[PDB]
């Protein structure tokens, strides 16, 4: 019901997509959400979406100091976070011979460094408040797949998934547990502004299950994972993609 | 809410440990039990224990008839399961030289065969009633370990993961969803009973959090793969061990 | 000749398909080969194709008294193997609804049970001799990907790759490996005159690789994990599939 | 034993360690080699160690006009690789607290971003040729483990492994293979300077096996995966550690 009351969420990337959902859904679990993403407009709106729960805070997770002053806005108001959700991402689509190395720096940088900086300094924060945490990293199903025209971007999630099983290591002694969320392919709408979009049809007949993934689908499982019901999960990756690759 | 108003769900092996627990969570998730042990004794009291909300009828997994009877009561009562967990098992503590043919059969026999002729019957009745169903089998972690001291208990729980990753093949397109869960080491009543109740500290020291898992622990992750949160999961397998091992 | 020199290495399931092409090259490798299959004719057909270095023995698998001569045959003529490859197994093709207890059973019963009896009796064979050994069972991508019209081939197999992790734990102390191979579709004697057959076009199309795969695809894996240079290996599983699925 | 004949292979981070193994291995198979190093040096001196057709080219992988000139070279002696090993990386020991972003950013940029520079270049001088080629990069079994005191590390090697399966799917065309191979700790001279070293006692404990790991170990299986043998993997990812981790 609000079995979250009493907790703050942070989201990043949370504007739309996938992020906006997960934010809406925690909001609707109880939980003060911080919406945040670079797209300052795009979290407004999706603060305003959500309601009364919700806060928008702007930052770049791969800028380090608008991370230090999300981060102190959120201590300032809350008295730290309970829950971080690391969602935000650049989403590519570009074909294996346009992958240069500055468009691998670029993902690598905002995907996986990003995240990077973003969990130190709310891991830190949880610590600092003596809260027991919960990190949830959002990856990529592409992982397992090796899926074509995005070879930066598995990379990056590969990266996300090795930082999680780490982190849960180096964070347990601390209450903290950390854990990935690999989604399959999602009618978000940075996938239907994508060339990504058109992998619908194909992607469908895979899957063990009827429908395109939707934003929602995440949302709920994130929740679960955010919830007292995984306090005995860490270290972990769940697969939410209709079944189109096992794990 | 009591999200599982309305629901019947079918736990095997539910006289003691996880699997009591499970029947115990899902009631107080609203779910209509069926508490079921081959020990017809132990599922009375378990029922008893659990509240009005729960059933016991006694079944012998391994038996073809017996399960048919199980399911015919079931059908009779509450027009058939929306959901089944599997989580009937032997957990044997057998010395490698002393697993001989008849030991491994009989693992083999109620833990992976066991576990067909429950899924057969139960899908059946989920697809006879048109019903949207979730299976749910408990596998086990040694399955990733390589556990010794359990060669045909790591074989079976294999199998139920293979199987697990068939079924949900199978089943998909019946709205019918099925993954499996692995605990790690958890402090059940037959736990305590064996050898392997001395190897909590050994398996402590490899977990990433700190404490005896518990049968808690397992029973509040299959309320989430029992509920409509998990509905874009199938085919999957969450291990749960408090970081022993990481999937 | 060269490197299985002096080597005695027994294959099951070898009078076709990819149970022989792994006989003809440890053969080529220099390995003393014993050709067993329970097609009593086919095994020593296959034998003869190999030349002076196969023996043929007929064993069933599944029996456990057919197995015990076999290796007391064995024993006699070489001192006993070095090298066990669990290549023996039913590829049935069988929808899911056609997928009954008898049908179940009998997988099992050969393709998981019977891996045990071999192993059991290899592993023991080996021991006594004070021979560091390999052992080496053909499982199957289809553990990974859930593959339809398997649903108890499946299971089996997952039971093998269990059995295979739990084992490796069991015998590393006596110096012996055990390791798994997962090929993907193979044009097999077997696959050849099943309706496996026309999966083909789905298969090649999922890999990364095009061509339909060949027993000597696998074979020339089998050679490597039975060599010295696989001796840090144990525990492990290797898929061997042109990149159907990533492991 | 000379099946590499005919064939050009490049090893970096080869001055010392596992990639000096794997350079002599391959040399002993027939290839020629390219030994790379950033210690300029040794990089000489083990090509000089190794003798056969080895040849050593300095080149700081993490540095694109490094890469550039080391592949100019290759072409300009040899008409190109036939083989890529991604070998080196920096092995760090960083308390969790310990990693900041200067940390983070450096061991990422040479262990994962410098691998893609170097792949990068190493695939497009194959596909120039026309080569069926091989690319093989070393991760490490702490992606399965979730390793402590090497956050960014893992990250990092999880990041290579993802990296290797995307890159099987877009090179599969071109008749170009890449795998992985994830050594455990192994007594390189990198970790004998290492705290790393302590490990030694506890990792042996946890092997299936005895003794502690060594470059050899390692270079045994590269040199089958740059084989014919191997043609039939791509986009797999093996695990080399006595069976410490099951993969
Ligand atoms: N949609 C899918 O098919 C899919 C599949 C697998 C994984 N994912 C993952 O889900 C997450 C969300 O994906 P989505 O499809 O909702 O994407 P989306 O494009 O719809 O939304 C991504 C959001 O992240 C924000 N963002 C980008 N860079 C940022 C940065 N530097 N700092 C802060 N915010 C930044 C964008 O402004 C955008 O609002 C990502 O981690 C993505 O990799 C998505
Ligand atoms: N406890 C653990 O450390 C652990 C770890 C991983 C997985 N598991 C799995 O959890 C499940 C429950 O384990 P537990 O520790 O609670 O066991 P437990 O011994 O405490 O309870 C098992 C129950 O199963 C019943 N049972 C045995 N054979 C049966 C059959 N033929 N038909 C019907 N019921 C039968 C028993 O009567 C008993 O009531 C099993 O699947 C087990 O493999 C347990
Ligand atoms: N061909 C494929 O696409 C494929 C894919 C993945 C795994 N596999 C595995 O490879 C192995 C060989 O497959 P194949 O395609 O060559 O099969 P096949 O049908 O061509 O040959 C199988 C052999 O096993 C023998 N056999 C059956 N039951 C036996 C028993 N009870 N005791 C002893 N021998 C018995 C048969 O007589 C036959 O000679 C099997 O383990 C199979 O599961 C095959
Ligand atoms: N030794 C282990 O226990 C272990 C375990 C798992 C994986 N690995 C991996 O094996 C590989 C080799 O490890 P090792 O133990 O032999 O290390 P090592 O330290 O002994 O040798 C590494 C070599 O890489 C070179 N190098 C470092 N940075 C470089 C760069 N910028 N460009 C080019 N060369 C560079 C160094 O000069 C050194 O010669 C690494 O990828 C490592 O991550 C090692």
């Known amino acids: 019901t609000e079995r979250l009351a009493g907790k703050t969420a942070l989201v990043t990337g949370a504007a739309q997509?996938?992020?906006?959902?997960?934010?809406?859904?925690?909001?609707?679990?109880?939980?003060?959400?911080?919406?945040?993403?670079?797209?300052?407009?795009?979290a407004k709106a999706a603060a305003a979406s959500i309601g009364k729960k919700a806060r928008a805070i702007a930052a770049d997770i791969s800028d380090p100091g608008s991370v230090k002053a999300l981060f102190a806005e959120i201590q300032a108001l809350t008295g730290g976070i309970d829950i971080l959700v690391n969602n935000a991402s650049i989403?590519?689509?570009?074909?294996?011979?346009?992958?240069?190395?500055?468009?691998?720096?670029?993902?690598?940088?905002?995907?996986?460094?990003?995240?990077?900086?973003?969990?130190?300094?709310?891991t830190d924060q949880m610590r600092a408040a003596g809260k027991a945490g919960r990190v949830i990293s959002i990856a990529s199903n592409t992982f397992f797949?090796?899926?074509?025209?995005?070879?930066?971007?598995?990379?990056?999630?590969?990266?996300v998934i090795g930082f999680t099983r780490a982190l849960a290591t180096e964070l347990g002694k601390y209450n903290i547990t950390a854990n990935a969320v690999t989604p399959g392919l999602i009618?978000?709408?940075?996938?239907?502004?994508?060339?990504?979009?058109?992998?619908?049809?194909?992607?469908?007949?895979?899957?063990?299950?009827?429908?395109?993934?939707?934003?929602?689908?995440?949302?709920?499982?994130?929740?679960?994972?955010?919830?007292?019901?995984?306090?005995?999960?860490?270290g972990q990756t769940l697969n939410v993609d209709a079944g189109m690759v096992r794990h």
Request: hydrophobic fraction near 45%; aromatic fraction near 8%; charged fraction near 20%.
């Open 187 to 234: 009618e978000s709408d940075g996938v239907k502004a994508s060339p990504h979009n058109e992998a619908f049809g194909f992607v469908e007949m895979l899957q063990a299950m009827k429908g395109k993934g939707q934003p929602e689908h995440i949302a709920d499982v994130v929740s679960f994972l955010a919830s007292d019901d995984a306090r005995w999960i860490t």
């Open 17 to 42: 997509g996938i992020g906006k959902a997960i934010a809406a859904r925690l909001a609707a679990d109880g939980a003060t959400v911080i919406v945040s993403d670079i797209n300052a407009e795009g």
């Open 91 to 122: 989403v590519p689509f570009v074909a294996w011979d346009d992958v240069d190395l500055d468009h691998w720096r670029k993902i690598i940088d905002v995907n996986l460094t990003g995240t990077f900086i973003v969990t130190r300094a709310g």
């Open 145 to 159: 797949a090796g899926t074509p025209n995005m070879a930066a971007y598995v990379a990056a999630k590969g990266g």
